[PDB]
Ligand binder design. Sequence first.
Ligand SMILES: CC(=O)O[C@@H]1[C@@H](O)[C@H](O[C@H]2[C@H](OC(=O)[C@H]3CC[C@@H]4[C@H](C3)O[C@@]3(C[C@H](OC(=O)/C=C/c5ccccc5)[C@H](C)CO3)[C@]43CO3)O[C@H](C)[C@@H](O)[C@@H]2OC(C)=O)O[C@H](C)[C@H]1O
Ligand SMILES: [Mg+2]
Ligand SMILES: [Mg+2]
Ligand SMILES: [Mg+2]
Ligand SMILES: [Mg+2]
Ligand SMILES: [Mg+2]
Ligand SMILES: [Mg+2]
Ligand SMILES: [Mg+2]
Ligand SMILES: [Mg+2]
Ligand SMILES: [Mg+2]
Ligand SMILES: [Mg+2]
Ligand SMILES: [Mg+2]
Ligand SMILES: [Mg+2]
Ligand SMILES: [Mg+2]
Ligand SMILES: [Mg+2]
Ligand SMILES: [Mg+2]
Ligand SMILES: [Mg+2]
Ligand SMILES: [Mg+2]
Ligand SMILES: [Mg+2]
Ligand SMILES: [Mg+2]
Ligand SMILES: [Mg+2]
Ligand SMILES: [Mg+2]
Ligand SMILES: [Mg+2]
Ligand SMILES: [Mg+2]
Ligand SMILES: [Mg+2]
Ligand SMILES: [Mg+2]
Ligand SMILES: [Mg+2]
Ligand SMILES: [Mg+2]
Ligand SMILES: [Mg+2]
Ligand SMILES: [Mg+2]
Ligand SMILES: [Mg+2]
Ligand SMILES: [Mg+2]
Ligand SMILES: [Mg+2]
Ligand SMILES: [Mg+2]
Ligand SMILES: [Mg+2]
Ligand SMILES: [Mg+2]
Ligand SMILES: [Mg+2]
Ligand SMILES: [Mg+2]
Ligand SMILES: [Mg+2]
Ligand SMILES: [Mg+2]
Ligand SMILES: [Mg+2]
Ligand SMILES: [Mg+2]
Ligand SMILES: [Mg+2]
Ligand SMILES: [Mg+2]
Ligand SMILES: [Mg+2]
Ligand SMILES: [Mg+2]
Ligand SMILES: [Mg+2]
Ligand SMILES: [Mg+2]
Ligand SMILES: [Mg+2]
Ligand SMILES: [Mg+2]
Ligand SMILES: [Mg+2]
Ligand SMILES: [Mg+2]
Ligand SMILES: [Mg+2]
Ligand SMILES: [Mg+2]
Ligand SMILES: [Mg+2]
Ligand SMILES: [Mg+2]
Ligand SMILES: [Mg+2]
Ligand SMILES: [Mg+2]
Ligand SMILES: [Mg+2]
Ligand SMILES: [Mg+2]
Ligand SMILES: [Mg+2]
Ligand SMILES: [Mg+2]
Ligand SMILES: [Mg+2]
Ligand SMILES: [Mg+2]
Ligand SMILES: [Mg+2]
Ligand SMILES: [Mg+2]
Ligand SMILES: [Mg+2]
Ligand SMILES: [Mg+2]
Ligand SMILES: [Mg+2]
Ligand SMILES: [Mg+2]
Ligand SMILES: [Mg+2]
Ligand SMILES: [Mg+2]
Ligand SMILES: [Mg+2]
Ligand SMILES: [Mg+2]
Ligand SMILES: [Mg+2]
Ligand SMILES: [Mg+2]
Ligand SMILES: [Mg+2]
Ligand SMILES: [Mg+2]
Ligand SMILES: [Mg+2]
Ligand SMILES: [Mg+2]
Ligand SMILES: [Mg+2]
Ligand SMILES: [Mg+2]
Ligand SMILES: [Mg+2]
Ligand SMILES: [Mg+2]
Ligand SMILES: [Mg+2]
Ligand SMILES: [Mg+2]
Ligand SMILES: [Mg+2]
Ligand SMILES: [Mg+2]
Ligand SMILES: [Mg+2]
Ligand SMILES: [Mg+2]
Ligand SMILES: [Mg+2]
Ligand SMILES: [Mg+2]
Ligand SMILES: [Mg+2]
Ligand SMILES: [Mg+2]
Ligand SMILES: [Mg+2]
Ligand SMILES: [Mg+2]
Ligand SMILES: [Mg+2]
Ligand SMILES: [Mg+2]
Ligand SMILES: [Mg+2]
Ligand SMILES: [Mg+2]
Ligand SMILES: [Mg+2]
Ligand SMILES: [Mg+2]
Ligand SMILES: [Mg+2]
Ligand SMILES: [Mg+2]
Ligand SMILES: [Mg+2]
Ligand SMILES: [Mg+2]
Ligand SMILES: [Mg+2]
Ligand SMILES: [Mg+2]
Ligand SMILES: [Mg+2]
Ligand SMILES: [Mg+2]
Ligand SMILES: [Mg+2]
Ligand SMILES: [Mg+2]
Ligand SMILES: [Mg+2]
Ligand SMILES: [Mg+2]
Ligand SMILES: [Mg+2]
Ligand SMILES: [Mg+2]
Ligand SMILES: [Mg+2]
Ligand SMILES: [Mg+2]
Ligand SMILES: [Mg+2]
Ligand SMILES: [Mg+2]
Ligand SMILES: [Mg+2]
Ligand SMILES: [Mg+2]
Ligand SMILES: [Mg+2]
Ligand SMILES: [Mg+2]
Ligand SMILES: [Mg+2]
Ligand SMILES: [Mg+2]
Ligand SMILES: [Mg+2]
Ligand SMILES: [Mg+2]
Ligand SMILES: [Mg+2]
Ligand SMILES: [Mg+2]
Ligand SMILES: [Mg+2]
Ligand SMILES: [Mg+2]
Ligand SMILES: [Mg+2]
Ligand SMILES: [Mg+2]
Ligand SMILES: [Mg+2]
Ligand SMILES: [Mg+2]
Ligand SMILES: [Mg+2]
Ligand SMILES: [Mg+2]
Ligand SMILES: [Mg+2]
Ligand SMILES: [Mg+2]
Ligand SMILES: [Mg+2]
Ligand SMILES: [Mg+2]
Ligand SMILES: [Mg+2]
Ligand SMILES: [Mg+2]
Ligand SMILES: [Mg+2]
Ligand SMILES: [Mg+2]
Ligand SMILES: [Mg+2]
Ligand SMILES: [Mg+2]
Ligand SMILES: [Mg+2]
Ligand SMILES: [Mg+2]
Ligand SMILES: [Mg+2]
Ligand SMILES: [Mg+2]
Ligand SMILES: [Mg+2]
Ligand SMILES: [Mg+2]
Ligand SMILES: [Mg+2]
Ligand SMILES: [Mg+2]
Ligand SMILES: [Mg+2]
Ligand SMILES: [Mg+2]
Ligand SMILES: [Mg+2]
Ligand SMILES: [Mg+2]
Ligand SMILES: [Mg+2]
Ligand SMILES: [Mg+2]
Ligand SMILES: [Mg+2]
Ligand SMILES: [Zn+2]
Lengths: 144, 103, 159, 185, 59, 100
Amino acid sequence: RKVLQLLRLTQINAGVFVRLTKATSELIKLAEPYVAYGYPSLSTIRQLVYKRGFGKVNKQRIALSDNAIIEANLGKFNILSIEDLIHEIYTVGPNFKQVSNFLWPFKLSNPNGGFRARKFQHFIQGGDTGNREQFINALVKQMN
Amino acid sequence: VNVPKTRKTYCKGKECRKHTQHKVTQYKAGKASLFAQGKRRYDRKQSGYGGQTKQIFHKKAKTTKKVVLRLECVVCKTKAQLPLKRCKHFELGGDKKQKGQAL
Amino acid sequence: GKSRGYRSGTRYAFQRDFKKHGAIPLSTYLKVYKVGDIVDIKANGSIQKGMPHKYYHGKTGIVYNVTKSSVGVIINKVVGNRYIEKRVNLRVEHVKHSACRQEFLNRVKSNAAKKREAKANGETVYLKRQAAKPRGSRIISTEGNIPQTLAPVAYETFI
Amino acid sequence: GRDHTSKQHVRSGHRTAPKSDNVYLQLLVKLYSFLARRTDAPFNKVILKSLFLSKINRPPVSVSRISRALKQKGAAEKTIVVVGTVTDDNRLLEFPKATIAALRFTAGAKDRILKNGGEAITLDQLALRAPKGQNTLIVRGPRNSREAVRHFGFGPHKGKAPRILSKGRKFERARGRRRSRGFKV
Amino acid sequence: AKSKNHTAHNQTRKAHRNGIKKPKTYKYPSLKGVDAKFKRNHRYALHGTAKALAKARAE
Amino acid sequence: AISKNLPLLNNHFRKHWQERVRVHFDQAGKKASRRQSRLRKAAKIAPRPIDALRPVVRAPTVKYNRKVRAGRGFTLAELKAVGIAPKYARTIGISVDHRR
RNA sequence: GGUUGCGGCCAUAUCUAGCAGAAAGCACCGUUCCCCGUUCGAUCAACCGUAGUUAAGCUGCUAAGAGCAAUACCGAGUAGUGUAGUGGGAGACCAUACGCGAAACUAUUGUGCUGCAAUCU
RNA sequence: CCUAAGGGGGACUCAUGGAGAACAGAAAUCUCCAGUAGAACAAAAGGGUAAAAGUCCCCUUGAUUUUGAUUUUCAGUGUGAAUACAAACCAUGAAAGUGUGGCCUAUCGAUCCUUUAGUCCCUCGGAAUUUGAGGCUAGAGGUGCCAGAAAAGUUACCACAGGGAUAACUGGCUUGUGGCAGUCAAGCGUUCAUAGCGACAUUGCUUUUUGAUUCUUCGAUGUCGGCUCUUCCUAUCAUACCGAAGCAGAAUUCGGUAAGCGUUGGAUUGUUCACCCACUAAUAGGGAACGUGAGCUGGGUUUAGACCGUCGUGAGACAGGUUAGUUU
RNA sequence: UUGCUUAAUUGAACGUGGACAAUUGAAUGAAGAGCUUUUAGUGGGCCAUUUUUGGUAAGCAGAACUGGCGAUGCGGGAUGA
RNA sequence: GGCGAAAGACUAAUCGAACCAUCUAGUAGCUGGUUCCUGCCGAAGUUUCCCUCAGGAUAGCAGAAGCUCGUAUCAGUUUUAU
RNA sequence: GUCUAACGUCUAUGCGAGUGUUUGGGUGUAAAACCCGUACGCGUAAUGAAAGUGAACGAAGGUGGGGGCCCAUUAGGGUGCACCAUCGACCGAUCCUGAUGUGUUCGGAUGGAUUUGAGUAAGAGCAUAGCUGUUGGGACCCGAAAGAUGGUGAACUAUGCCUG
Ligand SMILES: CC(=O)O[C@@H]1[C@@H](O)[C@H](O[C@H]2[C@H](OC(=O)[C@H]3CC[C@@H]4[C@H](C3)O[C@@]3(C[C@H](OC(=O)/C=C/c5ccccc5)[C@H](C)CO3)[C@]43CO3)O[C@H](C)[C@@H](O)[C@@H]2OC(C)=O)O[C@H](C)[C@H]1O
Ligand SMILES: [Mg+2]
Ligand SMILES: [Mg+2]
Ligand SMILES: [Mg+2]
Ligand SMILES: [Mg+2]
Ligand SMILES: [Mg+2]
Ligand SMILES: [Mg+2]
Ligand SMILES: [Mg+2]
Ligand SMILES: [Mg+2]
Ligand SMILES: [Mg+2]
Ligand SMILES: [Mg+2]
Ligand SMILES: [Mg+2]
Ligand SMILES: [Mg+2]
Ligand SMILES: [Mg+2]
Ligand SMILES: [Mg+2]
Ligand SMILES: [Mg+2]
Ligand SMILES: [Mg+2]
Ligand SMILES: [Mg+2]
Ligand SMILES: [Mg+2]
Ligand SMILES: [Mg+2]
Ligand SMILES: [Mg+2]
Ligand SMILES: [Mg+2]
Ligand SMILES: [Mg+2]
Ligand SMILES: [Mg+2]
Ligand SMILES: [Mg+2]
Ligand SMILES: [Mg+2]
Ligand SMILES: [Mg+2]
Ligand SMILES: [Mg+2]
Ligand SMILES: [Mg+2]
Ligand SMILES: [Mg+2]
Ligand SMILES: [Mg+2]
Ligand SMILES: [Mg+2]
Ligand SMILES: [Mg+2]
Ligand SMILES: [Mg+2]
Ligand SMILES: [Mg+2]
Ligand SMILES: [Mg+2]
Ligand SMILES: [Mg+2]
Ligand SMILES: [Mg+2]
Ligand SMILES: [Mg+2]
Ligand SMILES: [Mg+2]
Ligand SMILES: [Mg+2]
Ligand SMILES: [Mg+2]
Ligand SMILES: [Mg+2]
Ligand SMILES: [Mg+2]
Ligand SMILES: [Mg+2]
Ligand SMILES: [Mg+2]
Ligand SMILES: [Mg+2]
Ligand SMILES: [Mg+2]
Ligand SMILES: [Mg+2]
Ligand SMILES: [Mg+2]
Ligand SMILES: [Mg+2]
Ligand SMILES: [Mg+2]
Ligand SMILES: [Mg+2]
Ligand SMILES: [Mg+2]
Ligand SMILES: [Mg+2]
Ligand SMILES: [Mg+2]
Ligand SMILES: [Mg+2]
Ligand SMILES: [Mg+2]
Ligand SMILES: [Mg+2]
Ligand SMILES: [Mg+2]
Ligand SMILES: [Mg+2]
Ligand SMILES: [Mg+2]
Ligand SMILES: [Mg+2]
Ligand SMILES: [Mg+2]
Ligand SMILES: [Mg+2]
Ligand SMILES: [Mg+2]
Ligand SMILES: [Mg+2]
Ligand SMILES: [Mg+2]
Ligand SMILES: [Mg+2]
Ligand SMILES: [Mg+2]
Ligand SMILES: [Mg+2]
Ligand SMILES: [Mg+2]
Ligand SMILES: [Mg+2]
Ligand SMILES: [Mg+2]
Ligand SMILES: [Mg+2]
Ligand SMILES: [Mg+2]
Ligand SMILES: [Mg+2]
Ligand SMILES: [Mg+2]
Ligand SMILES: [Mg+2]
Ligand SMILES: [Mg+2]
Ligand SMILES: [Mg+2]
Ligand SMILES: [Mg+2]
Ligand SMILES: [Mg+2]
Ligand SMILES: [Mg+2]
Ligand SMILES: [Mg+2]
Ligand SMILES: [Mg+2]
Ligand SMILES: [Mg+2]
Ligand SMILES: [Mg+2]
Ligand SMILES: [Mg+2]
Ligand SMILES: [Mg+2]
Ligand SMILES: [Mg+2]
Ligand SMILES: [Mg+2]
Ligand SMILES: [Mg+2]
Ligand SMILES: [Mg+2]
Ligand SMILES: [Mg+2]
Ligand SMILES: [Mg+2]
Ligand SMILES: [Mg+2]
Ligand SMILES: [Mg+2]
Ligand SMILES: [Mg+2]
Ligand SMILES: [Mg+2]
Ligand SMILES: [Mg+2]
Ligand SMILES: [Mg+2]
Ligand SMILES: [Mg+2]
Ligand SMILES: [Mg+2]
Ligand SMILES: [Mg+2]
Ligand SMILES: [Mg+2]
Ligand SMILES: [Mg+2]
Ligand SMILES: [Mg+2]
Ligand SMILES: [Mg+2]
Ligand SMILES: [Mg+2]
Ligand SMILES: [Mg+2]
Ligand SMILES: [Mg+2]
Ligand SMILES: [Mg+2]
Ligand SMILES: [Mg+2]
Ligand SMILES: [Mg+2]
Ligand SMILES: [Mg+2]
Ligand SMILES: [Mg+2]
Ligand SMILES: [Mg+2]
Ligand SMILES: [Mg+2]
Ligand SMILES: [Mg+2]
Ligand SMILES: [Mg+2]
Ligand SMILES: [Mg+2]
Ligand SMILES: [Mg+2]
Ligand SMILES: [Mg+2]
Ligand SMILES: [Mg+2]
Ligand SMILES: [Mg+2]
Ligand SMILES: [Mg+2]
Ligand SMILES: [Mg+2]
Ligand SMILES: [Mg+2]
Ligand SMILES: [Mg+2]
Ligand SMILES: [Mg+2]
Ligand SMILES: [Mg+2]
Ligand SMILES: [Mg+2]
Ligand SMILES: [Mg+2]
Ligand SMILES: [Mg+2]
Ligand SMILES: [Mg+2]
Ligand SMILES: [Mg+2]
Ligand SMILES: [Mg+2]
Ligand SMILES: [Mg+2]
Ligand SMILES: [Mg+2]
Ligand SMILES: [Mg+2]
Ligand SMILES: [Mg+2]
Ligand SMILES: [Mg+2]
Ligand SMILES: [Mg+2]
Ligand SMILES: [Mg+2]
Ligand SMILES: [Mg+2]
Ligand SMILES: [Mg+2]
Ligand SMILES: [Mg+2]
Ligand SMILES: [Mg+2]
Ligand SMILES: [Mg+2]
Ligand SMILES: [Mg+2]
Ligand SMILES: [Mg+2]
Ligand SMILES: [Mg+2]
Ligand SMILES: [Mg+2]
Ligand SMILES: [Mg+2]
Ligand SMILES: [Mg+2]
Ligand SMILES: [Mg+2]
Ligand SMILES: [Mg+2]
Ligand SMILES: [Mg+2]
Ligand SMILES: [Mg+2]
Ligand SMILES: [Mg+2]
Ligand SMILES: [Mg+2]
Ligand SMILES: [Mg+2]
Ligand SMILES: [Zn+2]
């Protein structure tokens, strides 16, 4: 529960970007029975940021509808555009922490087509939790 | 328990302020005076009608008492008190242990 | 009848190590403890004076007082919903310097040495530690190492 | 559903207005609500917060406290600001010439300030000669000197004041306050 | 009659609503329990140190 | 019965106290009637003053040494010094105290 | 490098059985007036360094030595275990998923290192 | 429990084994070697201890004084116990050191009162002296239900507040116990394990036993048994059809399908149970709130009267015997 | 600096003055952190997974950690804390 | 208290202590009940002591009032070292 | 779940080292309103059982922070109230030392101490009111079995007597 809170995953179908090291890997390992995660493609990141991209401005969830919001909040980190933000996320950049924490956790819908017959078992065993790696793109396509 | 009749401990007398020789005696409680205020109050409360006015202890549990040594300084005559642990048997200046003797 | 004495349940905690009973090696008595030192606490069963309570066996704290044969160590103990500051007087037989200082104090020196070198060279150096990162790409040569094919083995009984 | 990491619907816990219904205190809040909202001067935001405080949160400032604050190095001609009552001190041997802006002045305080060549002005008069609180010095009275604070945090070995109606040898001095009567805490 | 004897159930829930708070650290710890002989002399060393700094600034 | 950090009280209300409650609703009525009685006394003896002349005496005890107040009557020595007999003095508006 | 005195770590140093040991050191060794201690100058005390000896102590080497120490395509990713499922099985228990992961066993290697002072073929 | 079994110092090394020495042997005393502790350390156990903490010897009183800080139990209150220091005064040792009781973990006690020690200090209040009394600090006298009232029974003549937070019916879980049934087959059965049995083991079923529990009911579900009457179960006593035999017949035994159909009259007992007599095809076993009391009866049990025995000083008790006792 | 400590000019503790500047020395998060006063109800609990004790066992009795029911509706388990 | 050829029986339908009024609104850790709306927050059956075991006090959980400040330095989590 | 006596916290108000007119006196258009003052209560000094003694080394202390203010010019410096942590100083109690002197047993200068106080360290209180909480009261409402005091009954009934 604490691990999911520190990942800002405090509701169902909430999505967040995590840079893989060891600390964050052991975090995700602790939350593994409750999350589905994987390796996102560039188009998935673009679609996420374009449709459901929100910024934390004065602790408020603000739609990313204009590049001025991004500049006003991330120009000291050399982010001046929505494409700068997408690039900084995709090719994990020197300012990944600030850019991903500026991004409000994505609030996705349920999959169009449903989940598997039983969610709460590992992706390897025919369930949905754990690492599905490239099938995270199909799952996000269902849910975003 | 065997305790010698003499002992050299610190003397609290203002004259001594040092270890001097002391005489060991078993402390004996003094006679209860009739004019102590608590005994004076007790006699007045018991008088008249009303029966027994103060509690009488019954539920005895201890089988020993704490022995107190009365140490009198031979130099300045200042007395001191030392309580010992609970012992069932206590002699003052008894025969010292003889180790090695036969049965 | 319940039993809850001072050293209850310390049968193995306060035992000497196997083939390590007896006299104390004298480096224990030659170490010097200063106020502010970080020390591990491990009760020695053969010295009963200045011995810690079983709670402090295995705890680490700060020296606050130095006496003839003992040091005072400050420990923070959980009592309900907060910490209480505990001040334990321990003879030096139950105390050892904490090895966590020497790693961080060396990293401070290494960061200072690296920074002045980059300053000397007029360049920059990054001193923050990093967690282990996912490994990069690589090419596996197969000269002398052509892949060997394995299969799951059949079941056998060996008794 | 949400896994709440903090309590929901929690008020800030700070006064945003005086509890008092004095219309003239509202006017002072009227003036410094405008000033704090528009000057970027940290002094005006502090004054607005201090105008909300309760009586025990604005302890009286003796005319001796102002004298000691004016005795700081380089503060002799500063304007003393007291959000509260300024009381007199008959233990002073002398008082300087000073300008003091306060909610209230006692009769002795006003007499003493004006006797020594000073001014005793209100907080609205302050806002015109110092709309940003320039060259001012805010003085606060002792909060922990209140009698009720003597009994706060009472306990064993705490050294606080017992809540007691009578004082004397027969009132809470025997057992627990004396080693001859059992223990002492 | 016979009742429940003991249980620590729900006790960690109660300790973690508002507690489990680490103690605050301060620059100067209290010298309570420090050796009296050191404390007696440490008083004289600090008093003399203040005098030397006072004279140096008075110069 | 005992709870919290509060002062320990001594509220002496264990007898039938409610049968002996005297409320002075008649404070104003007694004030008015006292004024009327005072007017009656004045009109009874006018122009003779309503107050007897009282002496001035030191208050007893170490706490009221400093204060001085009205006594009860002039001593026999004091009346002797001004040549007034006590029997006559009581009839000319002077108070006498044989005890002081 | 050897040896002695004082050591640190406290068996890679211990234990058993053989063999060797230049120089110096150490040792055994000689004596009982004296200080001293004993049933016993055996231990302890003192004296001589004079009469003798490396026999022993000590040191080094030898041993498919015992023990100890270290290492591992040894056993074994086994036992165990944290986490998961509206998995299997009547049950006892078991399998699987994401992780952590022994001990015994087997083989090999090693058998004190070192600080201060003094001294020596 | 201990003036040492406390404290200091010194010297030595225990349990045990082997090999030897007059009486002397399994065990007396002496000698050597081996001997990591396999002993001893007051006592329960655990830990700790080998030029020692063990054994022996010498000297001692630190088992002393003033009080603070700290650890455990903890509310971070008390008590008990313990730890490291500060200031004294000492013991011991050449000394460094060690010693603030017992190698460590248990071995204990508030207010009120009394008593003793200390300070010889304060007060007895109109002022003094001396007695007496009262204060301050530290001990002791004790609360073992050990944070600490001052305390005998009986009620079958009984009362009240409550409780299904809790027993005495039914019911519910369980099935040890009770009852019933299997399997493996060493043996029994003149030969022959299984016609019929069947030990040592082992798997089950049942809820007509008794336990275990205390979920329901204490502003009340009428607690035994019988009589009357209905229905249900089958683990079938009889009757039907069949298979098997160590079935010649007759008789008998085992089994299959089977609850359609019946399963009695009496002496004694309140009985359920039992036991006898007798008839019968047979006189099976059970359930239905241990069916069935606004169906009865009221013999038993279990109010109040009374007798006896045993018990009690007694009032009274008996799950012992006896007699009389409102069934809406 | 000291009256503590050292044979000491040795140390102990607290200091004056100077150097090391935002990668000021891991990650992730942070509707901000810290502090105070006062007072309610409660002080019968129970259940599930796992660890686990007594018992032949129990819808039995007793512990450990967590999550729940109690205090909670909603969809599913027909029905059911 | 009476009275009892004795049953704790009779003493005005009242008897193992009559009836009447008062003390008396006797006390009760035990029953029962406890009267309008909406909004926000939101528990405990656990610690210690108690002739304590159906009750209290105490700590904890909860509410309310706020106060000093404004990223300061916090966390029912991970990494690295020990 | 009330009212009252006495209280804790918090809040509002008046005045403020003081505060409170209401016991009482004056006055009145008469229980009102208006006015008056001595005392007294609380506060302004604590500590000790008491006899008693009784709060500045210093800018009413030092150190690290500290909002605000001043000088600057990222940064930096100065000043820093409240408050926090820490080390000190002063007053009382306890213990130690014991000067000139003296009703020769008094006095207690001076210098100290891991001791101790509900203290000082440029006052903060007093009064009125409100909610909430406490205690005594019938005490949120209704409820015992009991106890006591003083009276009324032998028209029923038990027993004696007298007369039928
Ligand atoms: C004859 C008899 O045995 O009864 C006596 C009774 O006579 C005695 O009464 C005494 C009487 O008792 C009391 O007043 C109480 C005082 C303190 C309480 C209690 C009784 O004593 C306690 C109990 C316990 O210590 C005792 O027990 C005391 C015994 C004692 C005996 C004689 C005198 C004083 C005390 C605590 C240590 C504290 O002291 C205390 C807390 O309970 O005190 C008077 C002065 C005496 O005259 C009187 O003694 C005589 C001679 O009759 O009290 C004892 C408790 C009873 O055992
Ligand atoms: Mg993230
Ligand atoms: Mg998983
Ligand atoms: Mg589709
Ligand atoms: Mg569809
Ligand atoms: Mg599907
Ligand atoms: Mg799909
Ligand atoms: Mg599905
Ligand atoms: Mg499905
Ligand atoms: Mg599959
Ligand atoms: Mg969609
Ligand atoms: Mg003496
Ligand atoms: Mg007395
Ligand atoms: Mg009399
Ligand atoms: Mg008499
Ligand atoms: Mg009387
Ligand atoms: Mg009497
Ligand atoms: Mg036992
Ligand atoms: Mg036990
Ligand atoms: Mg260990
Ligand atoms: Mg000890
Ligand atoms: Mg750099
Ligand atoms: Mg919602
Ligand atoms: Mg909530
Ligand atoms: Mg906040
Ligand atoms: Mg002026
Ligand atoms: Mg003050
Ligand atoms: Mg004060
Ligand atoms: Mg008070
Ligand atoms: Mg009080
Ligand atoms: Mg009970
Ligand atoms: Mg309970
Ligand atoms: Mg929390
Ligand atoms: Mg070499
Ligand atoms: Mg030689
Ligand atoms: Mg010799
Ligand atoms: Mg010799
Ligand atoms: Mg040799
Ligand atoms: Mg040789
Ligand atoms: Mg070998
Ligand atoms: Mg597993
Ligand atoms: Mg785990
Ligand atoms: Mg599972
Ligand atoms: Mg399924
Ligand atoms: Mg695995
Ligand atoms: Mg070797
Ligand atoms: Mg001993
Ligand atoms: Mg000894
Ligand atoms: Mg000894
Ligand atoms: Mg020795
Ligand atoms: Mg051996
Ligand atoms: Mg003793
Ligand atoms: Mg304690
Ligand atoms: Mg206790
Ligand atoms: Mg505590
Ligand atoms: Mg404590
Ligand atoms: Mg204590
Ligand atoms: Mg300790
Ligand atoms: Mg000593
Ligand atoms: Mg006692
Ligand atoms: Mg009492
Ligand atoms: Mg008198
Ligand atoms: Mg006198
Ligand atoms: Mg006592
Ligand atoms: Mg008790
Ligand atoms: Mg108790
Ligand atoms: Mg009793
Ligand atoms: Mg009775
Ligand atoms: Mg009877
Ligand atoms: Mg009976
Ligand atoms: Mg029940
Ligand atoms: Mg069974
Ligand atoms: Mg059976
Ligand atoms: Mg069978
Ligand atoms: Mg049954
Ligand atoms: Mg039942
Ligand atoms: Mg019932
Ligand atoms: Mg009913
Ligand atoms: Mg009912
Ligand atoms: Mg009924
Ligand atoms: Mg029924
Ligand atoms: Mg019933
Ligand atoms: Mg019925
Ligand atoms: Mg019945
Ligand atoms: Mg059948
Ligand atoms: Mg039929
Ligand atoms: Mg019959
Ligand atoms: Mg019959
Ligand atoms: Mg029978
Ligand atoms: Mg029934
Ligand atoms: Mg039934
Ligand atoms: Mg039955
Ligand atoms: Mg029935
Ligand atoms: Mg019926
Ligand atoms: Mg009936
Ligand atoms: Mg019946
Ligand atoms: Mg009918
Ligand atoms: Mg009957
Ligand atoms: Mg009958
Ligand atoms: Mg019978
Ligand atoms: Mg009967
Ligand atoms: Mg008899
Ligand atoms: Mg019988
Ligand atoms: Mg009977
Ligand atoms: Mg008979
Ligand atoms: Mg009859
Ligand atoms: Mg009827
Ligand atoms: Mg510096
Ligand atoms: Mg790291
Ligand atoms: Mg509360
Ligand atoms: Mg509370
Ligand atoms: Mg509470
Ligand atoms: Mg409460
Ligand atoms: Mg319960
Ligand atoms: Mg309850
Ligand atoms: Mg669950
Ligand atoms: Mg499972
Ligand atoms: Mg249970
Ligand atoms: Mg139960
Ligand atoms: Mg409930
Ligand atoms: Mg729910
Ligand atoms: Mg549903
Ligand atoms: Mg449902
Ligand atoms: Mg179902
Ligand atoms: Mg009578
Ligand atoms: Mg009579
Ligand atoms: Mg009877
Ligand atoms: Mg009668
Ligand atoms: Mg009548
Ligand atoms: Mg009647
Ligand atoms: Mg009638
Ligand atoms: Mg009647
Ligand atoms: Mg009532
Ligand atoms: Mg909520
Ligand atoms: Mg109760
Ligand atoms: Mg409570
Ligand atoms: Mg708790
Ligand atoms: Mg709170
Ligand atoms: Mg912070
Ligand atoms: Mg971990
Ligand atoms: Mg590590
Ligand atoms: Mg009040
Ligand atoms: Mg008036
Ligand atoms: Mg009138
Ligand atoms: Mg006054
Ligand atoms: Mg006054
Ligand atoms: Mg006063
Ligand atoms: Mg005193
Ligand atoms: Mg004192
Ligand atoms: Mg002189
Ligand atoms: Mg002289
Ligand atoms: Mg003199
Ligand atoms: Mg003089
Ligand atoms: Mg103080
Ligand atoms: Mg002050
Ligand atoms: Mg009330
Ligand atoms: Mg009330
Ligand atoms: Mg009533
Ligand atoms: Mg009555
Ligand atoms: Mg009575
Ligand atoms: Mg009467
Ligand atoms: Mg009567
Ligand atoms: Mg008649
Ligand atoms: Zn003496």
